[PDB]
Amino acid sequence: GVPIQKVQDDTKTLIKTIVTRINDISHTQSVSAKQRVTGLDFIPGLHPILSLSKMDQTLAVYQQVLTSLPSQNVLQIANDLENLRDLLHLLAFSKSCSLPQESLDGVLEASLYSTEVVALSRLQGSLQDILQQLDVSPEC
């Protein structure tokens, strides 16, 4: 019923689509994704995301962060992140494996600009890594 090759291709197209979206935020392309910024250590930035359960919980946290950012583009994109998690749920169902499921507000009031720009450039890096490893037999 569910064509796994089709789902994999739609997943790749959606990832590249999200990448183009992040390419449209002019202010984010010039900010170093890998640069460490003290205070936002809870955001699951670049730290080998090498498993489906880690990928899922990473995108879940990123969604929780985006829900609090008042930009329309990133919010619908968080909606796209929902679609991405559901696609990963179908892929984990395809491979057979179970998948289980604070201080952000303070930085949101005191430093909103930094939180969005960082969250987005680190997200772009995490997703670019995920893309580079969505073909080397991803495992649960």
Partner: protein
Amino acid sequence: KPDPPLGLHMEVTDDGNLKISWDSQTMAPFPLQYQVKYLENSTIVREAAEIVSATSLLVDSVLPGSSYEVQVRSKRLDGSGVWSDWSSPQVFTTQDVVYFPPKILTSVGSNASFHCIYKNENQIISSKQIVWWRNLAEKIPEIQYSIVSDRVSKVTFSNLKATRPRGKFTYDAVYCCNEQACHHRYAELYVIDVNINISCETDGYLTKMTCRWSPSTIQSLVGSTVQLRYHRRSLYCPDSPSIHPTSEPKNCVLQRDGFYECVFQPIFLLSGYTMWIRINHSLGSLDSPPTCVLPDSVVKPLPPSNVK
């Protein structure tokens, strides 16, 4: 016996200092002095008590990430008055990184400076290592840097360029960093094209003055009121357009072409009218380069009549 002071509040001044304010007894027909006992739970905890005649107290150079508990008591200034009981203690907390100023709103080409106090694991790093950063994109050059002290870092921008919007944001985000380690908090920079060409024109009957201006620049800052201020003196314009500080606002109306227009009627025909544009934001107030006018000189002629 006076009542305890009430309305205990602490705020952080622009200079990064602490001001404690409390409400005096309006019902008291006598002057009151107030003892403020304040304790800081910083890395170094200390307690102090001062006596002030006014309702405000100032403490210089607040420490980042510190607690402040304040109590105030009141006493009659004249006579053998009895000290009132201490007010309810009030607690104020500071944050990681200190800025001087927190924010700036200015115009193009100005000379605006800044200072940072960076806290890195309870270690106030030396200013020689503090690095200024513009919006996480380009580092500010060292030439514009300055050392107020070993702990206080400074930077300055001369010939400020107009803050070009990036996304919905109308302010440059300024960070001070412990070399490659950058904190999350920042400062906001607003540079606005304040040059407004006010176009006033006179009716053919010399009764009303229709003035126009396109605030095409301003449709980026929200929460800031925009208005037109003006002042008129007896006759004519001094060659230097300037503001007798007594000024009054003129209500003006939007037009379908996006311009703000408003009309003066009736008019003092031989009298000097100075005007400019006032932008009142939470940061402060910005004013356009003032311009003056004599109405009689800005009259559009009526078409010639009875032509055969």
